[PDB]
Write a protein that holds these residues in place. Structure first.
Motif, mmCIF file in Angstrom:
data_model
loop_
_atom_site.group_PDB
_atom_site.id
_atom_site.type_symbol
_atom_site.label_atom_id
_atom_site.label_comp_id
_atom_site.label_asym_id
_atom_site.label_seq_id
_atom_site.Cartn_x
_atom_site.Cartn_y
_atom_site.Cartn_z
ATOM 1 N N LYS A 40 -4.360 19.354 16.831
ATOM 2 C CA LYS A 40 -3.897 17.985 16.710
ATOM 3 C C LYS A 40 -4.765 17.090 17.599
ATOM 4 C CE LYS A 40 0.482 16.672 16.228
ATOM 5 N NZ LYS A 40 1.903 16.278 16.511
ATOM 6 N N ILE A 41 -5.182 15.961 17.016
ATOM 7 C CA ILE A 41 -5.958 14.949 17.716
ATOM 8 C C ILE A 41 -5.206 13.612 17.661
ATOM 9 C CG2 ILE A 41 -8.163 13.888 18.124
ATOM 10 C CD1 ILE A 41 -7.962 16.961 15.857
ATOM 11 N N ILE A 42 -4.725 13.172 18.806
ATOM 12 C CA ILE A 42 -4.056 11.922 18.933
ATOM 13 C C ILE A 42 -5.130 10.874 19.221
ATOM 14 C CG2 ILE A 42 -2.404 10.614 20.367
ATOM 15 C CD1 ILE A 42 -0.893 13.446 20.490
ATOM 16 N N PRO A 43 -5.295 9.909 18.313
ATOM 17 C CA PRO A 43 -6.341 8.936 18.566
ATOM 18 C C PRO A 43 -6.063 8.071 19.794
ATOM 19 C CG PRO A 43 -5.213 8.476 16.493
ATOM 20 C CD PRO A 43 -4.437 9.536 17.176
ATOM 21 N N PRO A 44 -7.114 7.508 20.395
ATOM 22 C CA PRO A 44 -6.917 6.580 21.527
ATOM 23 C C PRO A 44 -6.022 5.411 21.140
ATOM 24 C CG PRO A 44 -9.232 6.655 20.856
ATOM 25 C CD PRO A 44 -8.520 7.623 19.973
ATOM 26 N N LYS A 45 -5.243 4.916 22.083
ATOM 27 C CA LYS A 45 -4.244 3.876 21.794
ATOM 28 C C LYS A 45 -4.874 2.593 21.225
ATOM 29 C CE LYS A 45 -4.196 2.251 26.637
ATOM 30 N NZ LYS A 45 -5.363 3.089 27.034
ATOM 31 N N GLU A 46 -6.159 2.410 21.458
ATOM 32 C CA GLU A 46 -6.830 1.188 21.035
ATOM 33 C C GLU A 46 -7.252 1.303 19.574
ATOM 34 O OE1 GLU A 46 -7.532 2.039 25.492
ATOM 35 O OE2 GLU A 46 -7.866 3.174 23.626
ATOM 36 N N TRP A 47 -7.299 2.528 19.044
ATOM 37 C CA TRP A 47 -7.877 2.768 17.732
ATOM 38 C C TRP A 47 -6.867 2.465 16.646
ATOM 39 C CZ3 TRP A 47 -6.617 6.110 13.873
ATOM 40 C CH2 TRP A 47 -7.593 6.422 12.928
ATOM 41 N N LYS A 48 -7.373 1.969 15.519
ATOM 42 C CA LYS A 48 -6.579 1.652 14.342
ATOM 43 C C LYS A 48 -7.394 2.084 13.140
ATOM 44 N N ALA A 49 -6.740 2.716 12.166
ATOM 45 C CA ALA A 49 -7.422 3.159 10.971
ATOM 46 C C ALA A 49 -7.713 1.975 10.097
ATOM 47 C CB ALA A 49 -6.595 4.219 10.224
ATOM 48 N N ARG A 50 -6.783 1.041 10.054
ATOM 49 C CA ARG A 50 -6.938 -0.211 9.336
ATOM 50 C C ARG A 50 -5.871 -1.174 9.891
ATOM 51 N NH1 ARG A 50 -7.334 0.249 4.017
ATOM 52 N NH2 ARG A 50 -6.160 -1.532 3.224
ATOM 53 N N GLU A 51 -5.994 -2.463 9.565
ATOM 54 C CA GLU A 51 -5.123 -3.549 10.071
ATOM 55 C C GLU A 51 -3.682 -3.426 9.628
ATOM 56 N N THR A 52 -3.422 -3.306 8.332
ATOM 57 C CA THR A 52 -2.077 -3.021 7.811
ATOM 58 C C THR A 52 -2.144 -2.182 6.539
ATOM 59 O OG1 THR A 52 -1.799 -4.846 6.192
ATOM 60 C CG2 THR A 52 -1.339 -5.371 8.485
ATOM 61 N N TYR A 53 -1.004 -1.615 6.139
ATOM 62 C CA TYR A 53 -0.922 -0.903 4.875
ATOM 63 C C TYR A 53 -0.201 -1.736 3.827
ATOM 64 C CZ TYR A 53 -2.846 3.029 7.380
ATOM 65 O OH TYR A 53 -3.656 3.766 8.152
ATOM 66 N N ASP A 54 -0.295 -3.063 3.964
ATOM 67 C CA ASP A 54 0.569 -3.979 3.203
ATOM 68 C C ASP A 54 0.345 -3.885 1.721
ATOM 69 O OD1 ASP A 54 2.519 -5.247 4.762
ATOM 70 O OD2 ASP A 54 1.212 -6.936 5.283
ATOM 71 N N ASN A 55 -0.876 -3.566 1.295
ATOM 72 C CA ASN A 55 -1.204 -3.712 -0.105
ATOM 73 C C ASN A 55 -1.380 -2.416 -0.929
ATOM 74 O OD1 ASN A 55 -2.607 -6.358 1.486
ATOM 75 N ND2 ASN A 55 -1.518 -6.830 -0.425
ATOM 76 N N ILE A 56 -0.841 -1.284 -0.480
ATOM 77 C CA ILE A 56 -1.188 0.012 -1.075
ATOM 78 C C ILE A 56 -0.417 0.450 -2.315
ATOM 79 C CG2 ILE A 56 -2.102 1.000 1.044
ATOM 80 C CD1 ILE A 56 0.467 2.714 1.173
ATOM 81 N N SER A 57 0.646 -0.254 -2.639
ATOM 82 C CA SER A 57 1.413 -0.036 -3.831
ATOM 83 C C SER A 57 0.610 0.011 -5.062
ATOM 84 C CB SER A 57 2.401 -1.197 -4.023
ATOM 85 O OG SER A 57 3.005 -1.467 -2.780
ATOM 86 N N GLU A 58 -0.481 -0.707 -5.096
ATOM 87 C CA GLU A 58 -1.268 -0.813 -6.318
ATOM 88 C C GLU A 58 -2.253 0.345 -6.544
ATOM 89 O OE1 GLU A 58 1.366 -3.803 -5.973
ATOM 90 O OE2 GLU A 58 0.570 -2.986 -7.871
ATOM 91 N N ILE A 59 -2.342 1.274 -5.589
ATOM 92 C CA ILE A 59 -3.019 2.531 -5.854
ATOM 93 C C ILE A 59 -2.304 3.297 -6.985
ATOM 94 C CG2 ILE A 59 -3.617 4.793 -4.870
ATOM 95 C CD1 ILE A 59 -3.968 3.236 -2.219
ATOM 96 N N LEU A 60 -3.086 3.843 -7.904
ATOM 97 C CA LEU A 60 -2.558 4.623 -8.988
ATOM 98 C C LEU A 60 -2.672 6.098 -8.671
ATOM 99 C CD1 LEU A 60 -1.391 4.398 -11.950
ATOM 100 C CD2 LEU A 60 -3.677 5.057 -12.630
ATOM 101 N N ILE A 61 -1.557 6.764 -8.901
ATOM 102 C CA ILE A 61 -1.461 8.180 -8.916
ATOM 103 C C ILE A 61 -1.567 8.610 -10.410
ATOM 104 C CG2 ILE A 61 -0.173 10.171 -8.166
ATOM 105 C CD1 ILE A 61 1.390 8.500 -6.273
ATOM 106 N N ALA A 62 -2.772 8.933 -10.833
ATOM 107 C CA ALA A 62 -3.019 9.169 -12.257
ATOM 108 C C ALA A 62 -2.238 10.383 -12.792
ATOM 109 C CB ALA A 62 -4.506 9.364 -12.512
ATOM 110 N N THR A 63 -2.208 11.447 -12.012
ATOM 111 C CA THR A 63 -1.517 12.684 -12.402
ATOM 112 C C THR A 63 -0.564 13.173 -11.273
ATOM 113 O OG1 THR A 63 -3.538 13.164 -13.658
ATOM 114 C CG2 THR A 63 -1.917 14.939 -13.550
ATOM 115 N N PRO A 64 0.631 12.557 -11.161
ATOM 116 C CA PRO A 64 1.580 13.103 -10.201
ATOM 117 C C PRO A 64 1.947 14.513 -10.595
ATOM 118 C CG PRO A 64 2.267 10.933 -10.989
ATOM 119 C CD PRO A 64 1.211 11.428 -11.912
ATOM 120 N N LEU A 65 2.269 15.342 -9.600
ATOM 121 C CA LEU A 65 2.514 16.755 -9.855
ATOM 122 C C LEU A 65 3.918 17.135 -9.385
ATOM 123 C CD1 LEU A 65 -0.782 18.369 -8.521
ATOM 124 C CD2 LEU A 65 -0.336 17.697 -10.843
ATOM 125 N N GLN A 66 4.701 17.672 -10.309
ATOM 126 C CA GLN A 66 6.022 18.077 -10.033
ATOM 127 C C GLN A 66 5.944 19.549 -9.669
ATOM 128 O OE1 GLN A 66 8.775 18.447 -13.400
ATOM 129 N NE2 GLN A 66 10.161 17.152 -12.205
#
Ligand SMILES: O=C(O)CNC(=O)C(=O)O
Ligand SMILES: [Mg+2]
Ligand code: NI
Ligand SMILES: [Zn+2]
Length: 331
Positions: A40-66
């Motif tokens: 496990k690698i806990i990133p430094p407190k200053e680090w951010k992968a991106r600003e927000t995840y506000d807009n991710i709903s519009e990603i398509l899951i082309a083949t969801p798997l049950q």
């Protein structure tokens, strides 16, 4: 030797230590991290992968798997039934529905108990293996879309130039969504960033005891084993911690939370499940130490495991003897 008991280690790099990816990986391995198969690698407190995840709903899951389970609670296979495309928004809504949501529970331990007790009686839907990235391009440290490629590593180490590319994948999970017991393609490393949502619990066998896991799997899935010499490459088999403990298989467990990286190491078998709606990003990578593991990696030649374009060239250069028979399974 560092970490002789093969415990999962947890790293807390500083932002200074977080600039050089390869060097930090070598650092973790100098401390014996790799012996566990997982860190496990806990990133430094200053680090951010991106600003927000506000807009991710519009990603398509082309083949969801049950993920439909068969067998008993502690020893089961799962098959992936393809479902109709849905957006991340739709998937998140489904994950939060009464049918699919995380049940009430006291803590991770109580949830784990309920997972292993009740998994087989449900069929969660996984959005797995979606090519893409959620790292902001201005994130320069530990950006899974900007790592050095395995092809470039092979070229730096062995002087050969091959075709192929290497890009991240997203995984959208919900409660009970399961990743079966496996090592990476060509027994590469993997790195997995949990972007958002609920936790992911991981189980792992030390690389030096991988064969013991395989031996147990041949005894638990005796027909799968007759059908294919590397049937764990099919990524269908689940074995519970209880059953591993009962058969003396050395293993460890750990729960990854949103904002944390996990690295799997060459030939470290791992499995796990999701606690609720989440999104992870992962990609394979290599180091100089990987090269021998790549030469020794087992292959599925029965034709179930059906793997990437880029894996052709790894097998062709590292496993030229296997290359004739392996590509018959891949064609
Ligand atoms: O997150 C998942 O479902 C599966 N991920 C891995 O097996 C990995 O990162 O190596
Ligand atoms: Mg979107
Ligand atoms: Ni994996
Ligand atoms: Zn096979």
């Amino acid at each position: 030797a560092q970490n002789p008991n093969c415990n999962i280690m947890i790293f807390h790099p500083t932002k200074e230590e977080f600039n050089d990816f390869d060097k930090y990986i070598a650092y973790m391995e100098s401390q014996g991290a790799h012996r566990a198969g997982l860190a496990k690698i806990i990133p430094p407190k200053e680090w951010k992968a991106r600003e927000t995840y506000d807009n991710i709903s519009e990603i398509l899951i082309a083949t969801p798997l049950q993920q439909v389970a068969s067998g008993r609670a502690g020893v089961f296979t799962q098959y992936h039934k393809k479902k109709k495309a849905m957006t991340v928004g739709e998937y998140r809504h489904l994950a939060n529905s009464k049918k699919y949501q995380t049940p009430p529970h006291q803590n991770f331990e109580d949830l784990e108990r309920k997972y292993w007790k009740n998994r087989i009686y449900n069929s969660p839907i996984y959005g797995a293996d979606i090519s893409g990235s959620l790292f902001d391009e201005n994130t320069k440290q530990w950006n899974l879309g900007h790592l050095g490629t395995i092809q470039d590593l092979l070229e730096k180490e062995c002087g050969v130039v091959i075709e192929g590319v290497n890009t991240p994948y997203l995984y959208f999970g919900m409660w009970k969504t399961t990743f079966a017991w496996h090592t990476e393609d060509m027994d590469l490393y993997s790195i997995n960033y949990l972007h958002l949502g609920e936790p992911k619990t991981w189980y792992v066998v030390p690389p030096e005891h991988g064969q013991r896991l395989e031996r147990l799997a041949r005894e638990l899935f005796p027909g799968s084993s007759r059908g294919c010499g590397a049937f764990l490459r099919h990524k269908v088999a689940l074995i519970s911690p209880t059953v591993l403990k009962e058969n003396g298989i050395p293993f460890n467990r750990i729960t990854q939370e949103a904002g944390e990286f996990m690295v799997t190491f060459p030939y470290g078998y791992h499995a796990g499940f999701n606690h609720g709606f989440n999104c992870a990003e992962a990609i394979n990578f290599a180091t100089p130490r990987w090269i021998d593991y790549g030469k020794m990696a087992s292959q599925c030649s029965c034709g179930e495991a059906r793997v990437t374009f880029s894996m052709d060239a790894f097998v062709r250069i590292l496993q030229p003897e296997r290359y004739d028979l392996w590509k018959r399974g891949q064609d």
